[PDB]
Design a protein around this ligand. Structure first.
Ligand SMILES: Cc1cc2nc3c(=O)[nH]c(=O)nc-3n(C[C@H](O)[C@H](O)[C@H](O)COP(=O)(O)O)c2cc1C
Ligand SMILES: Cc1cc2nc3c(=O)[nH]c(=O)nc-3n(C[C@H](O)[C@H](O)[C@H](O)COP(=O)(O)O)c2cc1C
Ligand SMILES: Cc1ncc(COP(=O)(O)O)c(C=O)c1O
Lengths: 153, 202
């Protein structure tokens, strides 16, 4: 039901190890759409725009979702590929955020149906803790390694 | 929960004021026992055109805008002072819904902040003092040590780093999706002291 503590001693070398654990625990607890994430894109004037897409696939190169290539988000990524993704796992007192560049997948990802992979430049993990004081760890990709920091909730 | 999910959504079910429909949806989400009906994902953009996201709680709303409280030294506050253009998303996908709001984030006045702050319980009031939000911390003891410390506090004073923001209602999108249907998708766009209302393709 409830899972308690996120300490720097429990952290895996690969942030995706933590993601995968959390992702599967979300499916285990039958959350609606455990693969659902909110994509933030930015338009030509600096306006952020948001919508929910599904995580189809992930690995160390990126996180993958599909969308229409004529869609509003598709156009925005063309002008500016900087995006954020967030998994709203607040039902289990959790967030996960990914900062990266969205890059169109190739045609052979198997007309106007398309796919994007967001690089892993940052991955933040948020988990709700004792005395309503959350555990926050940010992985920042640097020099083919991850710099990890506790952040104040 | 499918009592609400089942029906389509069309112009003829839309009120002229979009907060009427938002309030309806919010209420249903509370009635449907959703985890945190008032939680919304706030999107900001840094100096480099890179968007950042995080969940916050909707505290108040009316025609002036939607309001949340945050730490004023946090990453989002700084991002907002450089670029006030934000987005809010209410991730109501258990009910196959999304409401997104576009507008501008302006700081609440001190006196606004004082009112809400006073309505909270003493726990959350002390809570506001603890964490230098978003800043790099050596370890969890630093917070816990300070949280325990602040139990020597009695009328609770207001931190100068604790306030909030009102996001204006420039655009509001409603999204009523479903299983195997095309999504019903409506944009309220503020113009000339009125709402231009359009169905968007899913
Ligand atoms: C649970 C859920 C999953 C969704 N998954 C996708 C998806 O994988 N791809 C997609 O294009 N839209 C998806 N949508 C719809 C989007 O939220 C959005 O309405 C659509 O992509 C158009 O966005 P845009 O006009 O900003 O480009 C989903 C909606 C919900 C509620
Ligand atoms: C359910 C839920 C509600 C939250 N509500 C708030 C809030 O009301 N205000 C706030 O500053 N942070 C809130 N947070 C924490 C933010 O998601 C985020 O971790 C923090 O504000 C720092 O964001 P920043 O580093 O981008 O400024 C909440 C988190 C969750 C899971
Ligand atoms: C601006 C606008 N909104 C909405 C619609 C469709 O409304 P509904 O399908 O809800 O009756 C149309 C159809 O042309 C339109 O032009």
């Amino acid at each position: 039901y409830t899972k308690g503590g996120l300490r720097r001693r429990d952290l895996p070398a690969d942030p995706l190890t933590l993601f995968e654990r959390w992702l599967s625990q979300a499916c285990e607890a039958k959350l609606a759409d455990p693969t659902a994430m909110v994509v933030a894109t930015v338009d030509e004037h600096g306006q952020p725009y948001q919508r929910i897409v599904l995580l189809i696939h992930y690995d160390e190169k990126g996180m993958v979702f599909y969308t229409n290539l004529g869609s509003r988000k598709a156009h925005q990524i063309e002008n500016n590929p900087r995006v954020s993704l967030l998994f709203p796992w607040h039902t289990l007192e959790r967030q996960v955020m990914v900062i990266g560049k969205a890059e169109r997948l190739s045609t052979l990802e198997v007309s106007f149906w398309g796919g994007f992979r967001v690089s892993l430049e940052q991955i933040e993990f948020w988990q709700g803790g004792e005395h309503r004081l959350a555990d926050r760890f940010l992985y920042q990709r640097e020099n083919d390694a991850w710099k990890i920091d506790r952040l104040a909730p």
